[PDB]
Amino acid sequence: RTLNRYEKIANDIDAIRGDYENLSDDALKHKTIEFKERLEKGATTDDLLVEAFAVVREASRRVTGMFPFKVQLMGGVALHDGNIAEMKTGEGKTLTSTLPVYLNALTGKGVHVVTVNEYLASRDAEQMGKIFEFLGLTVGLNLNSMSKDEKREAYAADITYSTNNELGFDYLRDNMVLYKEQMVQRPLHFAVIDEVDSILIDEARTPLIISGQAAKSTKLYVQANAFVRTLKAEKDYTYDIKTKAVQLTEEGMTKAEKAFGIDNLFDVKHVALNHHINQALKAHVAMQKDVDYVVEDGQVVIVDSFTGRLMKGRRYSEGLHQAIEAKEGLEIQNESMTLATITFQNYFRMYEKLAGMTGTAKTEEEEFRNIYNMQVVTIPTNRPVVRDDRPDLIYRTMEGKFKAVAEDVAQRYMTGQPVLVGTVAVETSELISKLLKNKGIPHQVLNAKNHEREAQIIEEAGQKGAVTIATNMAGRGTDIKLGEGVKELGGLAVVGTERHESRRIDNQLRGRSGRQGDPGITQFYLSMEDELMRRFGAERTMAMLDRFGMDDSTPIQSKMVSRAVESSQKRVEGNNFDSRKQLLQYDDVLRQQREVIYKQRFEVIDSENLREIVENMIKSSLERAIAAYTPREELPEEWKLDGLVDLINTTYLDEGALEKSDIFGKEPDEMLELIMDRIITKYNEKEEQFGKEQMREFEKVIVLRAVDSKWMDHIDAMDQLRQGIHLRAYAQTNPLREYQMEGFAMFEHMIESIEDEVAKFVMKA
Amino acid sequence: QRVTNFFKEVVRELKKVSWPNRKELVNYTAVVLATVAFFTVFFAVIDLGISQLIRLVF
Amino acid sequence: FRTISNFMRVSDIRNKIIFTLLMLIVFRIGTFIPVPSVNTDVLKLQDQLNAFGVLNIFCGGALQNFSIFAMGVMPYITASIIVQLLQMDVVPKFAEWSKQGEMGRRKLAQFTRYFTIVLGFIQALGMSYGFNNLAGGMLIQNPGIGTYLLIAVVLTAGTAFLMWLGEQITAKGVGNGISIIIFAGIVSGIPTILNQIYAQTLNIVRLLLVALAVVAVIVGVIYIQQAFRKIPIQYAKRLEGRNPVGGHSTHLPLKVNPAGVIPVIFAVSFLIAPPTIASFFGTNDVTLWIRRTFDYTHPVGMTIYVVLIIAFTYFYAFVQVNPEQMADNLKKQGGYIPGIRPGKNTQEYVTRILYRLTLVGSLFLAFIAVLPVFFVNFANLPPSAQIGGTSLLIVVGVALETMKQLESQLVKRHYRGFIK
Ligand SMILES: Nc1ncnc2c1ncn2[C@@H]1O[C@H](COP(=O)(O)OP(=O)(O)O)[C@@H](O)[C@H]1O
Ligand code: BEF
Ligand SMILES: [Mg+2]
Numbered sequence A: 001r002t003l004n005r006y007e008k009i010a011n012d013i014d015a016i017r018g019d020y021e022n023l024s025d026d027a028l029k030h031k032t033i034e035f036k037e038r039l040e041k042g043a044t045t046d047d048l049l050v051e052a053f054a055v056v057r058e059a060s061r062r063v064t065g066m067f068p069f070k071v072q073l074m075g076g077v078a079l080h081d082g083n084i085a086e087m088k089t090g091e092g093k094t095l096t097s098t099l100p101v102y103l104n105a106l107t108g109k110g111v112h113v114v115t116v117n118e119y120l121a122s123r124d125a126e127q128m129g130k131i132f133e134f135l136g137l138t139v140g141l142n143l144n145s146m147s148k149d150e151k152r153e154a155y156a157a158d159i160t161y162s163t164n165n166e167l168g169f170d171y172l173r174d175n176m177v178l179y180k181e182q183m184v185q186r187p188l189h190f191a192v193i194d195e196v197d198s199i200l201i202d203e204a205r206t207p208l209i210i211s212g213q214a215a216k217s218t219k220l221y222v223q224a225n226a227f228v229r230t231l232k233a234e235k236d237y238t239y240d241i242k243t244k245a246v247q248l249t250e251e252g253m254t255k256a257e258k259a260f261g262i263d264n265l266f267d268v269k270h271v272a273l274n275h276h277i278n279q280a281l282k283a284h285v286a287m288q289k290d291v292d293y294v295v296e297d298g299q300v301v302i303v304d305s306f307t308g309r310l311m312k313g314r315r316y317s318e319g320l321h322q323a324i325e326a327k328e329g330l331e332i333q334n335e336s337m338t339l340a341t342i343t344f345q346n347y348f349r350m351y352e353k354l355a356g357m358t359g360t361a362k363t364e365e366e367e368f369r370n371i372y373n374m375q376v377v378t379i380p381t382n383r384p385v386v387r388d389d390r391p392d393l394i395y396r397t398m399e400g401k402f403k404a405v406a407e408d409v410a411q412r413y414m415t416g417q418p419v420l421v422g423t424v425a426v427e428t429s430e431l432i433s434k435l436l437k438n439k440g441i442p443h444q445v446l447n448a449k450n451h452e453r454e455a456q457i458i459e460e461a462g463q464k465g466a467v468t469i470a471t472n473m474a475g476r477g478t479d480i481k482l483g484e485g486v487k488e489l490g491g492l493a494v495v496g497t498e499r500h501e502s503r504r505i506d507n508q509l510r511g512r513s514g515r516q517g518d519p520g521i522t523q524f525y526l527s528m529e530d531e532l533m534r535r536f537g538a539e540r541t542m543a544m545l546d547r548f549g550m551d552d553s554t555p556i557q558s559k560m561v562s563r564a565v566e567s568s569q570k571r572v573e574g575n576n577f578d579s580r581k582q583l584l585q586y587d588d589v590l591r592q593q594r595e596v597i598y599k600q601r602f603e604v605i606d607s608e609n610l611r612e613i614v615e616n617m618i619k620s621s622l623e624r625a626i627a628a629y630t631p632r633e634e635l636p637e638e639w640k641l642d643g644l645v646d647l648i649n650t651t652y653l654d655e656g657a658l659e660k661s662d663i664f665g666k667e668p669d670e671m672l673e674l675i676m677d678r679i680i681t682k683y684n685e686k687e688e689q690f691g692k693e694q695m696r697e698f699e700k701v702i703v704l705r706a707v708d709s710k711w712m713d714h715i716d717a718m719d720q721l722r723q724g725i726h727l728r729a730y731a732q733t734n735p736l737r738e739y740q741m742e743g744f745a746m747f748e749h750m751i752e753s754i755e756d757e758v759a760k761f762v763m764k765a
Numbered sequence B: 001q002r003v004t005n006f007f008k009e010v011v012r013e014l015k016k017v018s019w020p021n022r023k024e025l026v027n028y029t030a031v032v033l034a035t036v037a038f039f040t041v042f043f044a045v046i047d048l049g050i051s052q053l054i055r056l057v058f
Numbered sequence C: 001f002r003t004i005s006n007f008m009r010v011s012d013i014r015n016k017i018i019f020t021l022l023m024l025i026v027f028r029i030g031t032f033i034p035v036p037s038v039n040t041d042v043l044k045l046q047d048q049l050n051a052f053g054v055l056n057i058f059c060g061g062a063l064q065n066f067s068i069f070a071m072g073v074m075p076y077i078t079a080s081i082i083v084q085l086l087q088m089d090v091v092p093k094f095a096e097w098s099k100q101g102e103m104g105r106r107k108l109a110q111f112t113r114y115f116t117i118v119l120g121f122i123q124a125l126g127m128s129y130g131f132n133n134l135a136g137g138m139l140i141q142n143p144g145i146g147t148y149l150l151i152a153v154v155l156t157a158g159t160a161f162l163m164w165l166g167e168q169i170t171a172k173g174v175g176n177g178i179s180i181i182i183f184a185g186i187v188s189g190i191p192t193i194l195n196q197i198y199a200q201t202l203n204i205v206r207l208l209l210v211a212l213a214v215v216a217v218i219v220g221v222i223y224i225q226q227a228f229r230k231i232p233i234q235y236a237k238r239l240e241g242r243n244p245v246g247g248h249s250t251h252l253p254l255k256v257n258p259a260g261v262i263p264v265i266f267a268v269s270f271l272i273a274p275p276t277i278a279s280f281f282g283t284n285d286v287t288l289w290i291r292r293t294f295d296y297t298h299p300v301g302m303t304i305y306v307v308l309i310i311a312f313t314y315f316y317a318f319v320q321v322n323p324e325q326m327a328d329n330l331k332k333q334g335g336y337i338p339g340i341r342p343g344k345n346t347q348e349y350v351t352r353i354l355y356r357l358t359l360v361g362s363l364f365l366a367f368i369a370v371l372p373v374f375f376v377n378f379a380n381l382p383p384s385a386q387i388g389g390t391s392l393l394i395v396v397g398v399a400l401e402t403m404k405q406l407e408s409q410l411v412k413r414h415y416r417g418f419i420k
Helices: A004-018 A030-041 A049-063 A068-082 A092-105 A118-135 A150-155 A165-173 A196-206 A220-228 A232-236 A251-260 A271-284 A322-328 A344-348 A363-368 A396-414 A426-437 A451-460 A503-514 A531-536 A560-605 A611-628 A641-651 A668-690 A693-729 A735-763 B002-014 B022-057 C001-008 C010-031 C042-047 C072-085 C092-100 C104-135 C144-170 C177-200 C202-226 C261-277 C285-293 C299-320 C323-333 C344-375 C390-413
Strands: A084-086 A109-113 A139-141 A160-165 A190-194 A209-210 A237-241 A246-247 A293-297 A299-303 A338-343 A356-358 A376-378 A387-389 A394-396 A420-422 A443-446 A467-470 A494-496 A519-529 C058-059 C062-065 C229-234 C252-255
Touching: A004 A068, A004 A246, A004 A394, A030 A049, A030 A356, A049 A068, A049 A092, A049 A118, A049 A299, A068 A084, A068 A356, A068 A467, A092 A190, A092 A356, A109 A118, A109 A165, A109 C344, A118 A299, A118 A451, A139 A150, A150 A160, A150 A503, A165 A209, A165 A344, A196 A344, A196 A356, A196 A363, A196 A503, A196 C042, A209 A344, A209 B002, A220 A322, A232 A251, A246 A251, A246 A271, A246 C058, A246 C323, A246 C344, A271 A322, A299 A322, A338 A344, A338 A451, A338 A560, A338 A693, A344 A560, A356 C042, A356 C104, A356 C285, A363 A376, A363 A503, A363 A693, A376 A451, A387 A503, A394 A396, A394 A560, A394 C042, A396 A420, A396 A426, A396 A494, A396 A519, A420 C001, A426 A443, A426 A641, A443 A451, A451 A668, A467 A668, A494 A503, A503 A519, A519 A668, A519 C144, A531 A560, A560 A693, A560 A735, A611 A641, A611 A693, A611 A735, A668 A693, A668 A735, A693 A735, A693 C252, A735 C390, B022 C010, B022 C177, B022 C202, B022 C390, C001 C010, C001 C390, C010 C144, C010 C177, C042 C104, C062 C177, C072 C104, C072 C144, C072 C177, C072 C261, C092 C104, C104 C144, C202 C344, C202 C390, C229 C344, C252 C344, C261 C285, C261 C299, C261 C344, C285 C299, C323 C344
Parallel strands: A084 A356, A084 A376, A109 A160, A109 A190, A139 A160, A190 A356, A387 A519, A394 A519, A420 A467, A420 A494, A443 A467, A494 A519
Antiparallel strands: A209 A338, A237 A246, A293 A299, C058 C062, C229 C252
């Protein structure tokens, strides 16, 4: 059992922090130099662990006033081992990140501390960077707004604080550079992932995708948007509430074919019109305004589903963003084109060491074992949870639930206890803010749109008589501190208003209330026309909401609706489980291909002579060109060798240098050797006249341009294959094996095209 | 006479089926006969072996 | 051949080939182990030929076996086909369990395992009692109900052990598990059949003609089994720019024989049920007439057999493919056959395709099923052979599917690169 090992190491650190206490600064900052030279002579980080942890304990008490508890040392040892430290919400996970981050930044290779958003990254960077810069290391903070030089300074520091999006995008942009000295990241060494279950379980359902702008079309967006704006929500389309899929009906298809003058919408010449009609339908019906996006400064800005904040650079793929901009009446932008793609599983499994800490890991433990080979370690609390988690108050309608929520917030405001109401969308947050505006209750709102005042709102949210309505922004890592007298009122009642997509997320909201042994109440007010119940509730229990009556002043005191609420949430969790499993194995196929391509593109970049690489490319292209003619079947002179001579003179050997007589009646390998040594002397004349390093610049540009263009086309073709592959499961094959085999064939044809393009552009230039 | 029209449709349908060509037909028959012959010999040999061991142990 | 030397050069492929062969040796070892109280000498005296072993007899023109694996995985086969027939609008709990996803599928798999144990018990009781009646009451010593339930629970334990062995040889072995065990049962019966044909023996050229006809029927079976009618499918939810190829296009393949071998299950249940219900009534005139006309080695019974194979192939092709569920899935995921509206019109389009393909597949299945009668009659073979029945289809299908699984494991090593 490892937990007794963690307790033993924590007691070791306790004895020697007795030893480390009476040391001045410049004698405690000297311990970093001492550990660095002991780590360069012969020691490992595992031998230095107790002395480094005692130095961080003393330095933290000297800087921040906090002296880490022994459960924080247990979580630090569990993070140094590469495990997942599941300390509860409020327990002190930021100091327990600073223990193994200091221990593993002494070797000089760099530690990445990953968080969920940029508020938490900047907050932790400020406080724990005060600790680390006392000790003598360097803390960079990698933000979305920085330039490449500031990012390179942030990654060159000893400890880098960033969010998971910026790490993924920096990796993807480092494999699109032309010079090696444009890469910002160092080799990936250690990642401490704060809120692991958000990053590695929840947000790992999505890939990071870097796009680049393609040509602009606008007329079909306005045409399809003007068509869909007259379309009668039940006769001409069906909106499926379960999976938010909007489809035309046969009346709507008839009206579409009449409005555009076409005869069949489902031809292969009207696939662009059908795509524009479908994306205008999804933009109108399935994408509600203040729920899914916002309109800021004449632009559609996406509100993130997990973090609940605006994603400024990010745009919807496949023409949905342009359909939303046509719907809103804004300027329709250009299309896009996927340049690079990675998932968070495949990104963080490149990291040579991976740790993590969260409050809510234990239910996902086997997933952390199957993918990341990380073991969830549960840490004690050192002070018991006095937080009061009351059961949910289920109502019939949303108007009755919101009247109850406003009445609860009103009667907690009268005593002086601070309230934090937790919604999800921006529009329900504004609805409940106007529900408290009349009733005369002064509040703050923390939406995606109110992100500028966030650090101010959180500093006032725990005062006496402080109502804060907050979306997903608050309920993940936000540390609300209680004001004077608030701990006697049982401070910070969290009033949730909906169930989220897992028990982990609403446990995180309750964790905003708890906060290390302080009192707190967490009441959830659900409803029966909540979006979780409407979308994932089973159709049996969705029939007797007339049986419960139509009053909504008192909650439904049943036990069949509580089973329905829990089963709907378990249905969402199972759907997300299978969706992230599917994305995992199919991006394992693209992960193998991408790792081959990116490793060889990098060693094209830092190779100070490319003559052997380009000559092997020309020889492989030439062997395939020889074997494309000259087949094994028709040996005696049915070999069409003047066509091969024409191909060599059009691709390799400048228009006159080969005749039929040079390769007449030859074996394929001896004509290969004849053409190959003619190619070598032509290359040597090119390298003589062209220059020596100028020739390397020339063919580096050729090779990298070919690799980039064929790899973007391969990402597109691989996406199209993954569209049709379940239809391949209709023929009683395994469709994953069909995906792997067709992806291998597609990849090898892509590499043959890379070699053909490089051979042609080098030899014929 | 609907049935002769239907049989003309069946013959027309059989020309859109993607039948295996002669190279993969010969490769498939080689794999099938090799598997059947190998497992015939394999099962005869282990029946003889289990029979001798059964005669030893009883 | 080169490819079987390429398999044994990869360590993982060779590892699971060797594990599969060890599990087949385990299966054969257990097929030599007798049942508790079954008195093996009267069993070995019951046969009409000379098989190999003491638990193998040649009864009814079939190599019967009365070890602890006497049932094989046959209760698992009949439990799976019953559960699959119950999913289709008969039991509603199974319908919604199938509609749930990969976790309601686990509920259906759990029910199939418990139903397998129940059906294995009932089949072991019927089998032990019927074999004891065949021997004249002499097969089971101490014919009390405690001995029958001991025999039934040990045969059900043998079948559940074979299902565990199948789970092993599909987890850590070469391919599918139960299919490899079924293949092993058939081709382990092959050598004693060859020994009977040798012990029988114009005759040398007659057996050469028989072997050439067997290779011809194996080629015809590979030809029909590997043939797909590929319906083109167009998806209208991605832009598909920048010169789409058209070579690896998306399509929907329908087999020519989509049913498989299951029509012969239903046809032989229809052909064995009147003789058993007439056997409960004792010998009469109409009992002997029912026994005489429902025997498919004579042309009235063979005609009823062929007609039922064709009719159940049509039924089970439309159960297996289900063009209405196919049309709804195509409409929901946004695909369409080019030219055809994605609702009812694609359902009746692929219904017409399925009528024509099912005619060809049903005639092939009926011909394959009544081929051993013709080989026995017009080749003077012993009736032990059953040479070219539906076991031929099972053997060809398992051989080809395991070969494709192995080559798919092989190609993950050959990712070249342009540098090399
Ligand atoms: N050892 C300690 N002594 C005193 N206060 C601490 C200690 N560790 C953490 N805290 C405080 O407890 C709160 C826990 O917040 P935080 O660590 O952000 O929670 P989480 O563990 O969810 O990230 C912080 O405000 C921090 O100031
Ligand atoms: F940052 Be914690 F999980 F409250
Ligand atoms: Mg935290």
